[PDB]
């Protein structure tokens, strides 16, 4: 790190509280989509949200001041500013931004973009020098005064300048799944002080595989030597010329409207107000997700059965009980060595996100001609006398080429199959019957002849035999301990979360409960089939499932075409304030004027009118509903 200088004054300037308008929209995915509405839960700036009216540097006799603060990163940062002086040069991201942690660096000059991620030691007020090159009459960077040490770089990127060429440039910085996603957009404006109203779907610039924890940031500025004079004076530089404006992304739900060009034109937050949330319900609140599966288990022994050196005959199909293990089906589904892959009830994909009580493994060897009849509901000697699949089979059936396995010089006649059985095998039945079959009225007593025949015949699968005659291995997976990957995350109580238990998913609040599920019950439900509570594995504790703060959301809408003003109906609550306004955000829970308690429930804001009118849009309890350019309510008339 460079030698650091003390420029910040003890005098502090207070922050401000102003609106974000409708800025900060960026593309959630790179998949080309057009004229489609996409819902997503990710990090964003809500509309009308708190953005601070910061001043990076401010000159307040000739008295001048300098106060460049430090802000944490949390989940994500949105930045934009109105400046064409290029004094704003870059940013730093990371956790502490000292030499203790790996940190990323982006470099931009008149030539190109340079990126490096070494162990940098950043000063409290990092800066770069700039000077006027009078013979060529150009402002040029002089020296680097940010870091004197750079070790262990793991990424480098070179491209044309993006922040170079009243000038509003708007940038988005993310670091997700090891990729540092940078979204960029530039806009000339006709404003000075505030962030202008209106929408701007901000363009995705580039994704960069950095992969480092980031919890704090600070904007990078290039300070002129004028203030670097030994006094507190900046003779040739406006020590107040730089101001920044930063908002914090929050995990929120958004819907994106696409045009026929594939370009995003408008978006609506479900967390703006119930008036906005109305359009979310009609297509015209959670903050986090928690995932917990049965854990503390090893891997499942698929290789012990799939990759077995010796494979049993078809009439001797086996049972392996599979339990207390984690199963990875991607290596099985995506193996390039399985010609037959049919699953019933469950999809071939997303098996790694599913859990099962018990799984049975079926394995044998049959020829290519015998591959086709391996399916539920088939008929034949294998199907009727050797192996009968249940009609209601839940699982997968797998067959593939296994050609080069069971040949020998001199004839290999190991495997056999059944020709005679009086009755079909039941679903999941075993019969080891090998009695000498009687084909007549004379009891055979193990002696063959006319009407007395041996029920078993040796295959003798031969390599020189035809392709269909050649042995191909087949596997059936019976689904009744076993789960897909994901180490269970710790639990969080009293917070609105998206929960995923042992294959069951849902959203709500996890809290302690008194309902005692039976020692082998994992989930319990009340009336209307609502998952009321779940019992936590590895601790056998019971957690209640409470919806986040209530009331059914029914749309009372005149229509978007005429006006965007409607009313909210609370069916069976007293005038208890949405559980004492737990959120209290979003314009103070959407203004929390007139309170009109009805037999149909409690109503906020809408005036009650003494006289009655013909019913237009009912709310309940005899009251229907615009007039005086405002939302109105009145008792319905009977004629």
């Amino acid at each position, epitope marked *: 790190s460079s030698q650091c200088v003390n420029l910040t004054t003890r005098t502090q300037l207070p922050p401000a509280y102003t609106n974000s308008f409708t800025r900060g929209v960026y593309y959630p995915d790179k998949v080309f989509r057009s004229s489609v509405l996409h819902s997503t839960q990710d990090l964003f700036l809500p509309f009308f949200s708190n953005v601070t009216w910061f001043h990076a540097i401010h000159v307040s006799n000739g008295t001048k001041r300098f106060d460049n603060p430090v802000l944490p990163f949390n989940d994500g940062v949105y930045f934009a500013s109105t400046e064409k002086s290029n004094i704003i040069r870059g940013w730093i991201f990371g956790t502490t931004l000292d030499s203790k942690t790996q940190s990323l660096l982006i470099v931009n000059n008149a030539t190109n973009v340079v990126i490096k991620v070494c162990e940098f030691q950043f000063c409290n007020d990092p800066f770069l020098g700039v000077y006027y090159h009078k013979n060529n009459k150009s402002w040029m960077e002089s020296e680097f005064r940010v870091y004197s040490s750079a070790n262990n770089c793991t990424f480098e990127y070179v491209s044309q300048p993006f922040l170079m060429d009243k000038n509003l440039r708007e940038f988005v910085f993310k670091n997700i799944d090891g990729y540092f996603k940078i979204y960029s957009k530039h806009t000339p404006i006709n404003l000075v002080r505030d962030l202008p109203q209106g929408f701007s779907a901000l363009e995705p610039l580039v994704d960069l595989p950095i992969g480092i924890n980031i919890t704090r940031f600070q904007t990078l500025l290039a300070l002129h030597r004028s203030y670097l004079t030994p006094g507190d004076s900046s003779s040739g530089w406006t020590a107040g010329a730089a101001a920044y404006y930063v908002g914090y992304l929050q995990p929120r739900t958004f819907l994106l409207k696409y045009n026929e060009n594939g370009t995003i034109t408008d978006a609506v937050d479900c967390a703006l107000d119930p008036l906005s949330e109305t359009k979310c319900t009609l297509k015209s609140q959670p903050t986090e997700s928690i995932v917990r599966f049965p854990n503390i288990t090893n891997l499942c022994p698929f290789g012990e059965v799939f990759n077995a050196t010796r494979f049993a005959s078809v009439y001797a199909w086996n049972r392996k009980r599979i339990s207390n293990c984690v199963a990875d089906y991607s290596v099985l589904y995506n193996s390039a060595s399985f010609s037959t892959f049919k699953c019933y009830g469950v999809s071939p994909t997303k098996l790694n996100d599913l859990c099962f009580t018990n799984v049975y493994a079926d394995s044998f060897v049959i020829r290519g001609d015998e591959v086709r009849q391996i399916a539920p509901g088939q008929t034949g000697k294998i199907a009727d006398y050797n192996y009968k699949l249940p009609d209601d089979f839940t699982g997968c059936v797998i067959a593939w080429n296994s050609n080069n396995l069971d040949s020998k010089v001199g004839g290999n006649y190991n495997y056999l199959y059944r020709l005679f059985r009086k009755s079909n095998l039941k679903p999941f039945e075993r019969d080891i019957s090998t009695e000498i079959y009687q084909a007549g009225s004379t009891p055979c007593n193990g002696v063959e002849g006319f009407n007395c025949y041996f029920p078993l015949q040796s295959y003798g699968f031969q390599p020189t035999n035809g392709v269909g005659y050649q042995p191909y291995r087949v596997v059936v997976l019976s689904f009744e301990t076993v789960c897909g990957p994901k180490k269970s995350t710790n639990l969080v109580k009293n917070k609105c979360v998206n929960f995923n238990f042992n294959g069951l998913t849902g959203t709500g609040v996890l809290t302690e409960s008194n*309902k*005692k599920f*039976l*020692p*082998f*019950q994992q989930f319990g439900r*009340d009336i209307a089939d609502t998952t009321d509570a779940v019992r936590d594995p590895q601790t056998l504790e019971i957690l209640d499932i409470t919806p986040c703060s209530f009331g059914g959301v029914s749309v009372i809408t005149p229509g978007t075409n005429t006006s965007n003003q409607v009313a909210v109906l609370y069916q069976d609550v007293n005038c208890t304030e949405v559980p004492v306004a737990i959120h209290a955000d979003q314009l103070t829970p959407t203004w929390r004027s007139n309170v009109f308690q009805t037999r149909a429930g409690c109503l906020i804001g809408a005036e009650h009118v003494n006289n009655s009118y013909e019913c237009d849009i009912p709310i309940g309890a005899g009251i229907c509903a615009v007039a005086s350019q405002s939302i109105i309510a009145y008792t319905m008339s009977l004629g």
Partner: antibody
Amino acid sequence: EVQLVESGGGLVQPGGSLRLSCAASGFTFSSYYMHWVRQAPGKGLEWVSAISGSGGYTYYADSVKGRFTISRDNSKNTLYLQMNSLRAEDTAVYYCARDRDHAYDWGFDVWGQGTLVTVSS
Amino acid sequence: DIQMTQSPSSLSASVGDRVTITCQASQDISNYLNWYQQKPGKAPKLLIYDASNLETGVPSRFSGSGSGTDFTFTISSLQPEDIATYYCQQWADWPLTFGQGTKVEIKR
């Protein structure tokens, strides 16, 4: 003394309706799990329904699913068994059945005496 | 559902003998099993719970054990008041089924 007297039993036509009463005394009927069990004339027992947490919750059998409804009450601490669309196999002596599963004991509570129910023409 | 095909349907022995009545099971209920005693025309009563633990006020001659798919239970010494038919219950979650019954009687 804990005593589960039953009332409401009697003769009902097929498809009829009836509410059975099991007054509870000697204990907090509003804090102990309480059940219903039926036992066919001359045959074994069969589980019917239960209140998971006295004062709330629900629990039915598939053999009584939709056809039959369980309910309790607060204050006077009485138990009810609402039968709808009764059948011939529904004929049995019925016991307003007990329960203590919520606590460490995994069994039931008292066994009141239980009273006959018959469905015939 | 859980099925228990108790055998024998009915057995008899003399006073003081040891009696074994078989409760089977369906799927590894471990030790979540309770026992019931029911006299003719009388309300059923517990005999052993947790597959090994006698309730208070229960004769020590009544005892049971087992896990998985076979549950033994013994009447160490038949008594004139031991006359009854005994039921083995399924205390597995999803509580659907009782025992089909084992009737015990006296040689005389």
